[PDB]
Design an enzyme around this catalytic site. Structure first.
Site, PDB file in Angstrom:
ATOM      1  N   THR A 159       0.662  -1.299  -0.076  1.00  0.00           N
ATOM      2  CA  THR A 159      -0.168   0.055   0.146  1.00  0.00           C
ATOM      3  C   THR A 159       0.900   1.351  -0.089  1.00  0.00           C
ATOM      4  O   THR A 159       0.607   2.328  -0.874  1.00  0.00           O
ATOM      5  CB  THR A 159      -0.952   0.084   1.169  1.00  0.00           C
ATOM      6  N   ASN A 180       5.974  -1.711   3.523  1.00  0.00           N
ATOM      7  CA  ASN A 180       5.199  -1.411   4.563  1.00  0.00           C
ATOM      8  C   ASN A 180       6.060  -1.115   6.080  1.00  0.00           C
ATOM      9  O   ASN A 180       5.385  -0.773   6.763  1.00  0.00           O
ATOM     10  CB  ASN A 180       3.746  -2.199   4.905  1.00  0.00           C
ATOM     11  N   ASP A 261      -9.575  -3.268  -0.072  1.00  0.00           N
ATOM     12  CA  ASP A 261      -8.432  -4.132   0.729  1.00  0.00           C
ATOM     13  C   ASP A 261      -8.653  -4.862   1.921  1.00  0.00           C
ATOM     14  O   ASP A 261      -8.323  -5.991   2.277  1.00  0.00           O
ATOM     15  CB  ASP A 261      -7.418  -3.166   0.795  1.00  0.00           C
ATOM     16  N   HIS A 265      -8.609  -8.943   2.465  1.00  0.00           N
ATOM     17  CA  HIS A 265      -7.486  -9.777   3.551  1.00  0.00           C
ATOM     18  C   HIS A 265      -8.221 -10.941   4.119  1.00  0.00           C
ATOM     19  O   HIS A 265      -7.614 -11.812   4.268  1.00  0.00           O
ATOM     20  CB  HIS A 265      -6.875  -8.692   4.155  1.00  0.00           C
ATOM     21  N   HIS A 309      -3.128  -1.412  -5.687  1.00  0.00           N
ATOM     22  CA  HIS A 309      -2.523  -2.917  -6.229  1.00  0.00           C
ATOM     23  C   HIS A 309      -3.610  -3.556  -6.088  1.00  0.00           C
ATOM     24  O   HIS A 309      -4.787  -3.565  -5.622  1.00  0.00           O
ATOM     25  CB  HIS A 309      -1.622  -3.501  -5.065  1.00  0.00           C
ATOM     26  N   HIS A 420      -1.299  -9.273  -0.694  1.00  0.00           N
ATOM     27  CA  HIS A 420      -0.568  -8.725  -1.856  1.00  0.00           C
ATOM     28  C   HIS A 420       0.774  -8.334  -1.570  1.00  0.00           C
ATOM     29  O   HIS A 420       1.021  -8.439  -0.406  1.00  0.00           O
ATOM     30  CB  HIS A 420      -1.417  -7.766  -2.226  1.00  0.00           C
ATOM     31  N   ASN A 682      26.963  -0.389  -9.495  1.00  0.00           N
ATOM     32  CA  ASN A 682      26.371  -0.277  -8.193  1.00  0.00           C
ATOM     33  C   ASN A 682      24.935  -0.119  -8.105  1.00  0.00           C
ATOM     34  O   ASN A 682      24.184   0.512  -7.112  1.00  0.00           O
ATOM     35  CB  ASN A 682      26.954   1.619  -7.841  1.00  0.00           C
ATOM     36  N   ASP A 688      27.012   2.639 -15.752  1.00  0.00           N
ATOM     37  CA  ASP A 688      28.397   2.899 -15.211  1.00  0.00           C
ATOM     38  C   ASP A 688      29.295   3.818 -15.988  1.00  0.00           C
ATOM     39  O   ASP A 688      29.519   3.643 -17.069  1.00  0.00           O
ATOM     40  CB  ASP A 688      28.983   1.661 -14.530  1.00  0.00           C
TER      41      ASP A 688
HETATM   42 CL1  LIG Z   1      -4.327   2.813   6.454  1.00  0.00          CL
HETATM   43  C1  LIG Z   1      -3.989   4.096   5.404  1.00  0.00           C
HETATM   44  C2  LIG Z   1      -2.960   3.967   4.434  1.00  0.00           C
HETATM   45  C3  LIG Z   1      -2.934   4.988   3.532  1.00  0.00           C
HETATM   46  C4  LIG Z   1      -3.629   6.221   3.753  1.00  0.00           C
HETATM   47  C5  LIG Z   1      -3.737   7.539   2.889  1.00  0.00           C
HETATM   48  C6  LIG Z   1      -3.025   7.753   1.896  1.00  0.00           C
HETATM   49  C7  LIG Z   1      -4.025   8.632   0.841  1.00  0.00           C
HETATM   50  N1  LIG Z   1      -3.074   8.782  -0.164  1.00  0.00           N
HETATM   51  C8  LIG Z   1      -2.075   9.082  -0.356  1.00  0.00           C
HETATM   52  O1  LIG Z   1      -1.502   9.553  -1.512  1.00  0.00           O
HETATM   53  C9  LIG Z   1      -2.368  10.042  -2.747  1.00  0.00           C
HETATM   54  C10 LIG Z   1      -1.299  10.510  -3.639  1.00  0.00           C
HETATM   55  C11 LIG Z   1      -1.989  10.879  -4.918  1.00  0.00           C
HETATM   56  O2  LIG Z   1      -2.506   9.755  -5.624  1.00  0.00           O
HETATM   57  C12 LIG Z   1      -3.542   9.143  -4.706  1.00  0.00           C
HETATM   58  C13 LIG Z   1      -2.990   8.639  -3.406  1.00  0.00           C
HETATM   59  C14 LIG Z   1      -0.961   8.441   0.446  1.00  0.00           C
HETATM   60  C15 LIG Z   1       0.292   8.499   0.391  1.00  0.00           C
HETATM   61  C16 LIG Z   1       1.215   9.169   1.463  1.00  0.00           C
HETATM   62  C17 LIG Z   1       0.999   7.738   1.273  1.00  0.00           C
HETATM   63  C18 LIG Z   1      -2.006   8.091   1.820  1.00  0.00           C
HETATM   64  N2  LIG Z   1      -4.852   8.230   3.686  1.00  0.00           N
HETATM   65  N3  LIG Z   1      -5.322   7.511   4.796  1.00  0.00           N
HETATM   66  C19 LIG Z   1      -4.586   6.232   4.923  1.00  0.00           C
HETATM   67  N4  LIG Z   1      -4.666   5.297   5.703  1.00  0.00           N
HETATM   68 CA   LIG Z   2      25.208   2.218 -12.239  1.00  0.00          CA
HETATM   69 CL   LIG Z   3       7.107  -4.957   3.540  1.00  0.00          CL
HETATM   70 ZN   LIG Z   4      -3.632  -4.828   2.102  1.00  0.00          ZN
END
Ligand SMILES: Clc1ccc2c(-c3cnc(OC4CCOCC4)c(C4CC4)c3)n[nH]c2n1
Ligand SMILES: [Ca+2]
Ligand SMILES: [Cl-]
Ligand SMILES: [Zn+2]
Ligand SMILES: *[C@@H]1O[C@H](CO)[C@@H](O[C@@H]2O[C@H](CO)[C@@H](O[C@@H]3O[C@H](CO[C@H]4O[C@H](CO)[C@@H](O)[C@H](O[C@H]5O[C@H](CO)[C@@H](O)[C@H](O)[C@@H]5O[C@H]5O[C@H](CO)[C@@H](O)[C@H](O)[C@@H]5O)[C@@H]4O)[C@@H](O)[C@H](O[C@H]4O[C@H](CO)[C@@H](O)[C@H](O)[C@@H]4O[C@H]4O[C@H](CO)[C@@H](O)[C@H](O)[C@@H]4O)[C@@H]3O)[C@H](O)[C@H]2NC(C)=O)[C@H](O)[C@H]1NC(C)=O
Ligand SMILES: [K+]
Ligand code: NA
Length: 802
Positions: A159, A180, A261, A265, A309, A420, A682, A688
């Site tokens: 995620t 994660n 999601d 799970h 995902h 996932h 690297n 390189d």
């Molecule tokens: Cl448990 C859980 C896990 C993630 C989240 C988010 C969460 C929502 N949008 C996010 O980015 C947006 C970028 C633009 O495109 C769409 C997604 C981000 C990124 C910083 C990681 C996190 N809110 N609440 C949550 N609770």
């Molecule tokens: Ca390289």
């Molecule tokens: Cl992980």
């Molecule tokens: Zn999940």
């Protein structure tokens, strides 16, 4: 400390966050336990629910209600989303026919169409078809807007890595959120899903969209929602922000759903309990669209519906235990589950050896459901190595499986039925993309693409200049009606030399040996001046985008760009028609290497170094097996066509050149092939420089490649031969690790027909991955548009089924 005795009066879901110990009223305050005392009461009203009913119409404004059905609600911007439907005879957005949105139809005072990103956790790509009956709002977005059959996540398909890739355009290895769960040895700190440390800004690299917008004077809605804020309230907040005055109104907004999601799970991706979470996501989409229609914004806003995902069936009984492989299981720390990361439990332990851990985990059981790698040996397509947070030892776990340290870890942590995190080529991990709005195309399907490309498009949609990222800007122009980005080809930095015959045979002392008419002397000369070049170099020569010294070498059957610095070709180009014939290397020529009279002894490899180097042998870039005639075959044995190869790798290479090239030419109606070496000591995914090479053929300055690539192009319309193609192209490529053993392939002591192609498929690549790794730019001369060529360069042939 928070002096939580301030007040949220008039501050509900404030756009600028306030600094401790003043109390907060923003959509993230809950997560820091820092909301003012009255946040729940003022900002999280629930009275009377989320919908207008017949009798609520024209009510007297009661400020205690969750949303309003009163007369003034529209101008206040706080009606329930179904207000016009219940109380004004209006239809739901989903019940209206779709009509092309040719231009933005926005209220006065809007400077650009707003962007709303609707992201859904664990939304597997096949849900679009399989749940279509219970998702009428989503299905209308999809069929009316622009959609892909699926979108490829990044690895690991977790995620946080994926949401942060969406926000930044960067691979996890560059943005820093590499799982994660993480340990950073420089900070000596850990990052976990639960808890405080993940809020520290030093985890989060690159530049996310909200910061890119702010820096360039575009206002952003706060993207993240505390988990306890219900979905209805998130929608109502966004719609309220959309009613702010022009000078305070954000231009970009994000909604995030923890479903499907959360349920996946528990019940698996297709558990019968999954219908309800999908219905509920669709209901939320419906609320947004109904709310936009009420504000007359439904033909003004661009909406992106995007997953992070998919989800796969995974249960407790499909767990492999490292304790069944390792005797020293207590001297290691494992990051477990759908991927494995191993490090030493204690850095004070000097008897910990990664080498013996890998060996003890390698091909030990007949059906072993994970494969260990040093991280630098992982398929380059994963871009998963160049970060101190990624452990040296990695396990790629088979789809449907888990890996854990000891059985105690699983039953003292069957709970789950889905998970996932696997390889991002796996079908079950694929997710969704739909774009709907004035800037997207109407009823248009686009090919699958990678989520690293979206940051550039979101910048385009907002008129922003993207921070440097891993997208290829322009490769998704075909999604967009307007706002396209018109890129130019990079300029060539080094121009080639074209050497003629300048050295006599006797000037070479390389320890190489070889057992080797006016009609046919005019022939050889013309071939060496590039007479057959239009046959073997179909899309122009690749441009060299860095400073170096190299020669173009022409031959009857192939053309090469030979590097005087690395003593071998950077690229070799040849075309094999459907009709071409495979011959073998004649016996008198088995060990023949011939000096190239166009290239000085001092810029040539030598045979002696190979004789001396008991580990290293050599191979050829243009294969002798595919020579057009016994006379042309002598060209294939030039010292300038030779490259260093481990005997274990020659098994791979020989099968590719002897069997597979001809096979693809038959199947694809001719192929053009470009092959060459890659040096990435690297493991940063980038070419390189010479001072970065860690290994040489013994006693010499011949550098040893870390990988070998090939790019195999033909006509997409396979009724036309590769060399006479009138329209779009078709490509597959690979980047094979150049390894002294075949430990990666558990079946390698069998015939190459049983394992080699499987290995090549695992190391499938995008032409763009090869470009980063070589500093070359391919397809410089085609009749296709550059945007189309950019899309072709980001293509990945995945070898999954439908
Ligand atoms: Cl448990 C859980 C896990 C993630 C989240 C988010 C969460 C929502 N949008 C996010 O980015 C947006 C970028 C633009 O495109 C769409 C997604 C981000 C990124 C910083 C990681 C996190 N809110 N609440 C949550 N609770
Ligand atoms: Ca390289
Ligand atoms: Cl992980
Ligand atoms: Zn999940
Ligand atoms: C995907 O796209 C991304 C984005 O374009 C590509 O990554 C870029 O690659 C650039 C080229 O290598 C790289 O350029 C270097 O920048 C150095 C300055 O770095 C800081 O500033 C930037 C800009 O704001 C910032 O983004 C950086 O953030 C990184 O670091 C912190 C943690 O340290 C993280 O929070 C963050 O996530 C990010 O980490 C990632 O990048 C670094 C590399 O910078 C990795 O080490 C991490 O693992 C992680 O992946 C930084 O805060 C600059 O100092 C470099 O300059 C050196 O090299 C030049 C070459 O021109 C040389 O001339 C100089 O002398 C200099 O060398 C000196 O330092 C050496 C090392 O100490 C030393 O050996 C020498 O002797 C000298 O003293 C360099 O120009 C750029 O930073 C990243 N950007 C990002 C965001 O990652 C990526 O390549 C793409 N991937 C593919 C496959 O295409
Ligand atoms: K040898
Ligand atoms: Na093997």
């Amino acid at each position: 400390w928070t002096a939580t005795s301030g007040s949220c009066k008039g501050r509900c879901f404030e756009l600028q966050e306030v600094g401790p110990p003043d109390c907060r009223c923003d959509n993230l305050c809950k997560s820091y336990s820092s909301c003012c005392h009255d946040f729940d009461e003022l900002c999280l009203k629930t009275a009377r629910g989320w919908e207008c009913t017949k009798d609520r119409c024209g009510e007297v404004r009661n400020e205690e209600n969750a949303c309003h059905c009163s007369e003034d609600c529209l101008s206040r911007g706080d009606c329930c989303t179904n207000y016009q439907v219940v109380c004004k005879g209006e239809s739901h957005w989903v019940d209206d026919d779709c009509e092309e949105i040719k231009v933005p139809e926005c209220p006065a005072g809007f400077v650009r169409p707003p962007l709303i990103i609707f992201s859904v956790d664990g939304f597997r790509a096949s849900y679009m078809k399989k749940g279509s009956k219970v998702m009428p709002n989503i299905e209308k977005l999809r069929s009316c807007g622009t959609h892909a059959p699926y979108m490829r996540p990044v690895y690991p398909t977790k995620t946080f890595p994926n949401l942060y890739t969406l926000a930044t355009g960067l691979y996890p290895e560059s943005h820093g959120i590499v799982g994660n769960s993480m340990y950073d040895p420089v900070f000596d700190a850990s990052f976990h899903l639960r808890g405080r440390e993940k809020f520290n800004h030093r985890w989060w690299g690159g530049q996310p969209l909200w910061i890119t917008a702010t820096k360039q004077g575009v206002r952003a809605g706060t993207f993240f929602w505390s988990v306890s804020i219900p979905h209805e309230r998130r929608i109502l907040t966004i719609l309220q922000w959309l009613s702010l005055p022009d000078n305070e109104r954000p231009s970009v907004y994000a909604f995030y759903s923890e479903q499907p999601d959360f349920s996946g799970h528990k019940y698996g991706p297709f558990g019968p309990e999954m219908t309800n979470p999908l219905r509920e996501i669709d209901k939320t989409v419906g609320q947004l669209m109904d709310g936009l229609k009420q504000l007359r914004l439904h033909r003004c806003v661009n909406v992106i519906f995007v997953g992070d995902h998919g989800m796969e069936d995974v249960t407790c009984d499909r767990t492999e235990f490292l304790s069944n492989y390792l005797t020293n299981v207590d001297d290691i720390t494992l990051v477990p589950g759908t991927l494995g990361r191993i490090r030493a439990k204690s850095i004070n332990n000097s008897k910990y050896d990664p080498k013996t851990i890998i060996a003890a985990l390698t091909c030990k059981k007949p059906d072993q459901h994970f494969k260990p790698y040093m991280k630098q040996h992982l398929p380059k397509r994963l871009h998963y190595a160049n970060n101190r947070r990624i452990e040296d030892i990695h396990l790629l776990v088979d789809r449907r499986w888990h890996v854990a340290r000891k059985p105690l870890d699983v039953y003292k942590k069957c709970f789950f039925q889905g998970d996932h995190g696997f390889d991002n080529k796996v079908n079950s991990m694929q997710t969704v993309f739909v774009g709907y709005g004035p800037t997207f195309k109407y009823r248009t399907k686009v090919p699958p693409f990678e989520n690293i490309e979206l940051y550039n498009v979101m910048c385009d949609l907002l008129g922003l200049k993207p921070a440097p990222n891993n997208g290829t800007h322009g490769s998704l122009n075909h999604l967009l009606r307007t706002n396209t980005f018109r890129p130019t080809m990079p300029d060539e930095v080094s121009r080639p030399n074209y050497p003629g015959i300048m050295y006599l045979q006797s000037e070479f002392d390389l320890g190489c040996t070889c057992d080797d008419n006016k009609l046919e002397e005019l022939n050889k000369r013309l071939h060496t001046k590039g007479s057959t070049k239009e046959r073997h170099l179909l899309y122009g020569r690749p441009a060299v985008l860095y400073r170096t010294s190299y020669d173009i070498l022409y031959h009857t059957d192939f053309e090469s760009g030979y590097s005087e610095i690395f003593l071998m070709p950077l690229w070799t180009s040849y075309t094999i028609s459907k009709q071409a014939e495979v011959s073998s290397i004649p016996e008198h020529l088995t060990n023949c290497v011939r000096p190239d009279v166009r290239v000085s002894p001092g810029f040539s490899q030598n045979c002696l170094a190979y004789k001396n180097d008991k580990q290293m042998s050599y191979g050829f870039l243009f294969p002798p097996y595919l020579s057009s005639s016994p006379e042309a075959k002598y060209d294939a044995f030039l010292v300038t066509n030779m490259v260093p190869m481990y005997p274990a790798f020659k098994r791979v290479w020989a099968y590719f050149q002897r069997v597979l090239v001809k096979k693809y030419a038959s199947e694809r109606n001719g192929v053009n092939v470009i092959s060459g070496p890659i040096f990435d000591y690297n493991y940063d995914g980038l070419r390189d420089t010479e001072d970065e090479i860690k290994q040489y053929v013994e006693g010499s300055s011949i550098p040893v490649p870390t990988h070998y690539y090939s790019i195999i192009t033909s006509c997409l319309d396979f009724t036309q031969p590769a060399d006479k193609c009138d329209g779009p192209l078709s490509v597959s490529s690979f980047i094979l690790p150049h390894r002294p053993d075949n430990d990666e392939s558990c079946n390698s002591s069998e015939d190459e027909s049983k394992w080699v192609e499987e290995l090549m498929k695992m190391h499938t690549a995008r032409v763009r991955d090869i470009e980063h790794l070589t500093g070359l730019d391919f397809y410089r001369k085609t009749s296709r548009s550059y945007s189309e060529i950019l899309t072709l360069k980001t293509y990945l042939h995945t070898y999954e089924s439908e």
